[PDB]
Amino acid sequence: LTVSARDAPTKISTLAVKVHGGSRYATKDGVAHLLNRFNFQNTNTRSALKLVRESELLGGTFKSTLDREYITLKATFLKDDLPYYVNALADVLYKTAFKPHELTESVLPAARYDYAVAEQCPVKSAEDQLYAITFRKGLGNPLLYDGVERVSLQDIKDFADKVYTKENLEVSGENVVEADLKRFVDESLLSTLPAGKSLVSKSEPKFFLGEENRVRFIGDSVAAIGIPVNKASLAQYEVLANYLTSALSELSGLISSAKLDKFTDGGLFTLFVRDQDSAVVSSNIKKIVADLKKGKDLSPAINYTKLKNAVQNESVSSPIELNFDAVKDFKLGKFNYVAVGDVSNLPYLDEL
Amino acid sequence: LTVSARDAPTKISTLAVKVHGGSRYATKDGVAHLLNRFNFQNTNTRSALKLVRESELLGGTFKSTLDREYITLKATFLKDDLPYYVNALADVLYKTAFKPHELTESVLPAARYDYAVAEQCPVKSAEDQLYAITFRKGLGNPLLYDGVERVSLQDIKDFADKVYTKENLEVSGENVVEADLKRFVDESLLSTLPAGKSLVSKSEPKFFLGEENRVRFIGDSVAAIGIPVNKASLAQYEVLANYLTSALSELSGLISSAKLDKFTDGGLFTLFVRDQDSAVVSSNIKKIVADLKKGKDLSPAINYTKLKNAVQNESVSSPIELNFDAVKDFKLGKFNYVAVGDVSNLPYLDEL
Amino acid sequence: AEVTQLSNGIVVATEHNPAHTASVGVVFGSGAANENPYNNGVSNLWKNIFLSKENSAVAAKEGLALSSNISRDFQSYIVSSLPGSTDKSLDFLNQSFIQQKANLLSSSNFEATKKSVLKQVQDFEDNDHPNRVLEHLHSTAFQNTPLSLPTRGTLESLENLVVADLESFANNHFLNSNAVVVGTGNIKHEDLVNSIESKNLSLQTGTKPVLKKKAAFLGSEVRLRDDTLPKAWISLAVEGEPVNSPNYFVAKLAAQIFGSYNAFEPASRLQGIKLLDNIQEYQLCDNFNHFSLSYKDSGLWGFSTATRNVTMIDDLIHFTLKQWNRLTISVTDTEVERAKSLLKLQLGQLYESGNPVNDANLLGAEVLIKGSKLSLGEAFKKIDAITVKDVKAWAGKRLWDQDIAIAGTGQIEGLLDYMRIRSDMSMMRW
Amino acid sequence: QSFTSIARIGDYILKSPVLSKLCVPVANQFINLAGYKKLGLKFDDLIAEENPIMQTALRRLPEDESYARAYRIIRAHQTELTHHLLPRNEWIKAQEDVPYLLPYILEAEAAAKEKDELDNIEVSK
Amino acid sequence: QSFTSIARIGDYILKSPVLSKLCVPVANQFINLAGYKKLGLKFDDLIAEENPIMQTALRRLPEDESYARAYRIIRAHQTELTHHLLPRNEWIKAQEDVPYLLPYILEAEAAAKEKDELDNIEVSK
Amino acid sequence: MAFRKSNVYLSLVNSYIIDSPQPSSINYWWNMGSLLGLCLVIQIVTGIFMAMHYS
Amino acid sequence: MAFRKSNVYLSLVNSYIIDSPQPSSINYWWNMGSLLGLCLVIQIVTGIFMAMHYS
Ligand code: HEC
Ligand code: HEC
């Protein structure tokens, strides 16, 4: 029930309600996806239609976005209309109706859409495999619903109960008067919510290395690697990422993506080499792995790698730092490899 | 250019032309497939239509089977009309038209069907994934065409040039007069054919053990293991398979299928645990692996495993033998594991 | 050729052709057709105890393989073995049909066997649509008559069956007079006849089984419409010819004319079948096969088919039946010739198989009705005899303007009424 | 009339130097008098396509020749509806006026001829 | 007439002890005289479905109930065309004549009514 | 596809008087429709024939 | 979809006089058809009106 804020002399305000119900905490393969897509449907006192129609006349919108760890309920509006959105968001968490038909007529469709869109971008199939082979059942859980294991209308309601509780959520109002936000968060239906135990462990959730999976896909062939980090080691893996995506690295043009996914208990560093023909994909990763095996750094990236991690900071969270103007050397231990696309024309873990 | 026979007072004969061109030696992913599906199409001197209209009036049919190692061109007919079916199979190897439209209108479609069917049977999606991980790139070649890497009309043709050669194929007459076959073959286009080098190696090629691969799937979940065998250690794995496929095993009801694929340079042993819910699959596999690790046998399978292997063996090759009555002891070293279906609620190689 | 048959105290029949293994088994002249609505599925229940894990291990050690078959007209229990172990078989056959006729039926095995066929049959009715539709075709074509009983037996009469029923049936049917022991593979005739005559005795000799009422055909239909199924499977037939009939082959040749077809297999679409012109323009079905099922009392001549083109089923039937009309008025000479070659071909592959368990089932069934197996060479002689004129007479009796049996499942809303289909059995004339 | 027929008669003429030297000129003049080249069309574009054979052919035609043919036909309609002729330089020069569809047609024709024959083949014992 | 309106008027008669005692008996009587029960049909089956609201409801009606309704209707036509009634023990019984489709309708009408309101809401500053 | 279905003129005749899906239970009151059709013909035919003599 | 498109009667019109796909290049000779249609009307109308005075 943490209530943050900010305020400023602006006109747009964005109220966010973070709930630890992401794909990690998912009880069944994809329930998180479905519950996210279920948010903002019918509540026992406000149909989905009226919520929209009404919100439009005020000048505001809603959105429910799924993370690998959260289910954020953002709500952008016109500052002075603060209360409406508070009670509105609350109303959702507390009393969404979950009618059997809304699932068949709205939710499942919207979900199968989300999945089919994702199902056609190999960098995202490579990334889904990366998490799956590194952190088996924790963050290795499928982000989206694909019906591999049937999720009934009940399963959604259950996971909705586990997840929509006081201890597990955090309100965060950007450009909002903190005094009024708390006053309004209280006296609202948010407080009348159950207070089940939060679902966040500070301990590192197993790692697994030297694992590889090969997925046959038609079209763009893509090779990628993921390396799990620690609660302190993630400091250098962050700069390594920005270093590999800057004009400072001789081999930035040989990869497509490189980033570090941060968590409150760890992280995964991902590097993707996507192209067209498997020949230029192989050569481009066989070198990336080769030259990084021959550790190198000097970190000229610092004071830039923290300029990129400066603009990417506004979502009320700012761990690390410090170990900037600090560690400046990187080797390359073990990792996990996934080859999506032209399988019989892509390197294995043996080579590399 | 080998030529066999048998002869009997029967009414039905059956010509065969085993050409080493199975998925094993495919230059691109699926060419073996496409070529097989391409057989019996138009030839410069006979239309796919006439071949059929004729053979029907003659009493006889043509077939083209694809092995992991062969491309069998069998032809069942009335004993007397022997010369026809010899020239018939000849014309196909030396002068198949390979017209661009026959690809788009007949081959591609049928090949697409073969793959559409196979894609729904999780045991053949498991067995394919197995060869892929054990033998890697030898027999590890996918059996069927799926267009992950494009194959042009030329490829199907270049590849047909390689495989359809004297020193690579064996005529295998069954229920045919030895003298007359050899006689007819040598005055048919089988002798005019280019004689390139044989594509068979006498040595065991790369095993790779302790490999695992997981495939997400909608339908029946299947857990399965594979074990590469030695050029001699195979005779025992044949009784291992039969023991588990009989009432002699205290666990023949926990598995769906158990067999040993035999080749001239090794072989692969596969056991599948297929079922509707992931739980039963989990139990029955976790058990077989632990139950076999604590080895057993004593050979009550002997004298039976050599009964099932007596009827099966009717196709001009009765090797094995000897090692039975001799070897009779089994355990369970290292293996390969693929879990298809509800991957999330199915075991990993870690446990087992 | 071969095929030799001799009596004794029981009747024995063998067919040896030096190959691989050799199988011996007892084939009873009673089966599904000899059951009742309430005890139905008793034979399919014997088949599974004979193939039980308990009995399977006993023959596995000894180096044998068990194979059972349940049909309408007969029943069979066969044991496979190596050429030399020809005596190991009889000592097992006899052990299970005399010594263990008290064992096996012991609870814990019967309950295990029954729970397994109850599932086995529940799987069949939920999944094997083509064969299920065919089973229902018999069910309605011969309703309220012996032949109408499904071989696997109903799902209800099955869970009401107890050991007693099994025993009662065995005691009434598994008899000396209603049985034939057969031996195929490579085992000689004189080797078996003597090995059997070694241990004398009879076991219920002089006892005859309870007779019944001759099976009859009835123009009718059964429509198991299931809109949730992705295809529409349908079978349709007329009263056929029984085995040991003047037209046994003439009828079998007519089916071969229209034959079988698989819309996805390139070679199949190239066949010399006039019907295939009409069906390929709009792809009326995925597949279809023509048959000529023969039995002791009656038979069924018609075809089965599956289709995804659910809105044009009426044409599938229309064209198919317009072709059948041809057999009475315009069947050409080359259509008949082609049939012979292809009949002989498929007929040969049936008899001449590399599996004695098939050969056994073929020898038993025949000698169990006509008391002798017709040599394959003798068949070809009859097949080549058949003239265009012959096919037309047969069609005039059997096919032209005759009642029909229809059965279907899946999206069959487009299958028109009985009377609409029934009408197509003929054509207008002056 | 079949192209198998047209191609029969035509070649025979084209072979015997007597008929050849006498007809080819008339034919060349007949064609330049026809005026289709002036609309940016090749003769094969004129072949009436409302029949199984032509339909079979057109489908079997390689992608590029097809898109090209598509353009030519549209261009013809636009020009005709404007009642002009294409600028002289855009006219199909006789060297371009190739029978590109023809091989496909003849293939299809003979294929049909056979199917037809094999459907009525008599038997002789 | 809307079911929203029917239930509005019906419930009101039901909820009042005076009106209840004076109407319901006449109601059960009117129902027995109608006779649909003797044809094996629940009154909800009789509701006309050629309109969006009913389509919406029938679409939303759970499988078990749909397949049964399907049978009931097919059964009724078959009976009606034979000019017989079903055997009395097959007649839909009083505690079977349940308004199963009614809630889905009421909900569908509710949703429709709202949309219409929200499509014409006037604004006042 | 059958002819009665494929022909431009017979398909009309077909979907109206041959393949037209009817409710199995319709009684004889549904027979009045065709009767009227007949009536229209009787009137028209008889009329034109009488018209050849009318002034 | 538009009313002219969905309506039973109007649609027949829409697909014959309104949305009917014509080849861009048909010339004035293709105008003869509508003219024959007009003649039929003129003939029919002028005729019925004279019938009111004819013997
Ligand atoms: C010219 C064609 C013609 C048509 C078409 C025609 N009629 Fe007539 N009708 C006549 C003639 C001529 C008479 C005068 C002779 C007679 O009385 O029958 C007549 C007379 C009548 C009469 C007078 C009854 C009587 O005393 O005979 C009635 C009523 C009548 N028509 C009804 C109809 C109806 C209704 C239709 C159409 C549904 C119809 N007619 C169509 C020609 C026609
Ligand atoms: C005042 C109304 C009305 C008139 C007058 C009328 N009809 Fe109908 N007609 C109907 C309706 C409404 C139906 C549909 C009834 C149903 O099938 O439930 C119908 C249906 C029909 C049918 C189907 C068979 C049947 O009886 O249901 C035909 C055919 C038909 N009418 C012909 C005609 C012809 C021909 C005329 C006169 C020349 C005519 N109608 C005049 C109302 C009328």
Curated annotation (Swiss-Prot), chains A, B:
Gene Ontology process terms (BP): aerobic respiration; cellular respiration; mitochondrial electron transport, ubiquinol to cytochrome c; proteolysis; proton transmembrane transport
SUPFAM superfamilies: LuxS/MPP-like metallohydrolase (SSF63411)
A GO CC term assigned to this protein in UniProt: mitochondrial inner membrane
Quaternary context: Component of the ubiquinol-cytochrome c oxidoreductase (cytochrome b-c1 complex, complex III, CIII), a multisubunit enzyme composed of 10 subunits. The complex is composed of 3 respiratory subunits cytochrome b (COB), cytochrome c1 (CYT1) and Rieske protein (RIP1), 2 core protein subunits COR1 and QCR2, and 5 low-molecular weight protein subunits QCR6, QCR7, QCR8, QCR9 and QCR10.
UniProt KW Transcription keyword: no
Keywords recorded for this protein, A-Z: Electron transport, Membrane, Mitochondrion, Mitochondrion inner membrane, Phosphoprotein, Respiratory chain, Transit peptide, Transport
Predominant place of localization: mitochondrion
Keyword Transit peptide: yes
Record organism: Saccharomyces cerevisiae (strain ATCC 204508 / S288c)
Role of this protein: Component of the ubiquinol-cytochrome c oxidoreductase, a multisubunit transmembrane complex that is part of the mitochondrial electron transport chain which drives oxidative phosphorylation.
Miscellaneous comment as given in the Swiss-Prot or TrEMBL entry: Present with 35700 molecules/cell in log phase SD medium.
Source organism superkingdom: Eukaryota
UniProt protein name: Cytochrome b-c1 complex subunit 2, mitochondrial
A Pfam entry, by short name: Peptidase_M16
Modified residues (Phosphoserine): 125, 152
GO molecular function: metal ion binding; metalloendopeptidase activity
Signal peptide: none
Compartments (UniProt record): Mitochondrion inner membrane
Membrane topology according to the record: Peripheral membrane protein
Swiss-Prot record, chain C:
Annotated coiled-coil segments of the chain: none
Biological process annotations from GO: aerobic respiration; cellular respiration; mitochondrial electron transport, ubiquinol to cytochrome c; protein processing involved in protein targeting to mitochondrion; proton transmembrane transport
Membrane-topology descriptor: Peripheral membrane protein
UniProt KW keywords: Electron transport, Membrane, Mitochondrion, Mitochondrion inner membrane, Respiratory chain, Transit peptide, Transport
Location(s) in or outside the cell: Mitochondrion inner membrane
One cellular component term from this protein's GO annotations in UniProt: respiratory chain complex III
GO terms of molecular function: metal ion binding; metalloendopeptidase activity
Subunit and partners: Component of the ubiquinol-cytochrome c oxidoreductase (cytochrome b-c1 complex, complex III, CIII), a multisubunit enzyme composed of 10 subunits. The complex is composed of 3 respiratory subunits cytochrome b (COB), cytochrome c1 (CYT1) and Rieske protein (RIP1), 2 core protein subunits COR1 and QCR2, and 5 low-molecular weight protein subunits QCR6, QCR7, QCR8, QCR9 and QCR10.
Family statement: Belongs to the peptidase M16 family. UQCRC1/QCR1 subfamily.
Further information: Present with 19300 molecules/cell in log phase SD medium.
Record's function text: Component of the ubiquinol-cytochrome c oxidoreductase, a multisubunit transmembrane complex that is part of the mitochondrial electron transport chain which drives oxidative phosphorylation.
Name of protein: Cytochrome b-c1 complex subunit 1, mitochondrial
Gene (name only): COR1
Curated annotation (Swiss-Prot), chains D, E:
Subcellular location: Mitochondrion inner membrane
Primary subcellular site in the record, as a coarse category: mitochondrion
Any Gene Ontology biological process: cellular respiration
Cellular compartments per GO CC: matrix side of mitochondrial inner membrane; mitochondrial inner membrane; mitochondrion; respiratory chain complex III
Its biological purpose: Component of the ubiquinol-cytochrome c oxidoreductase, a multisubunit transmembrane complex that is part of the mitochondrial electron transport chain which drives oxidative phosphorylation.
Subunit structure comment from the entry: Component of the ubiquinol-cytochrome c oxidoreductase (cytochrome b-c1 complex, complex III, CIII), a multisubunit enzyme composed of 10 subunits. The complex is composed of 3 respiratory subunits cytochrome b (COB), cytochrome c1 (CYT1) and Rieske protein (RIP1), 2 core protein subunits COR1 and QCR2, and 5 low-molecular weight protein subunits QCR6, QCR7, QCR8, QCR9 and QCR10.
Family (UniProt): Belongs to the UQCRB/QCR7 family.
Name recorded for this polypeptide: Cytochrome b-c1 complex subunit 7, mitochondrial
Natural source organism: Saccharomyces cerevisiae (strain ATCC 204508 / S288c)
Swiss-Prot record, chains F, G:
Segments passing through the bilayer: 28-51
Residues bound to a ubiquinone: 16
Residue ranges, Mitochondrial matrix side: 1-27
Localization per record: Mitochondrion inner membrane
Function: Component of the ubiquinol-cytochrome c oxidoreductase, a multisubunit transmembrane complex that is part of the mitochondrial electron transport chain which drives oxidative phosphorylation.
Remarks, miscellaneous: Heme 1 (or BL or b562) is low-potential and absorbs at about 562 nm, and heme 2 (or BH or b566) is high-potential and absorbs at about 566 nm.
Family the entry assigns: Belongs to the cytochrome b family.
Subunit structure: Component of the ubiquinol-cytochrome c oxidoreductase (cytochrome b-c1 complex, complex III, CIII), a multisubunit enzyme composed of 10 subunits. The complex is composed of 3 respiratory subunits cytochrome b (COB), cytochrome c1 (CYT1) and Rieske protein (RIP1), 2 core protein subunits COR1 and QCR2, and 5 low-molecular weight protein subunits QCR6, QCR7, QCR8, QCR9 and QCR10.
Protein name in UniProt: Cytochrome b
Organism: Saccharomyces cerevisiae (strain ATCC 204508 / S288c)
Covered residues, full protein: 1 to 55 of 385
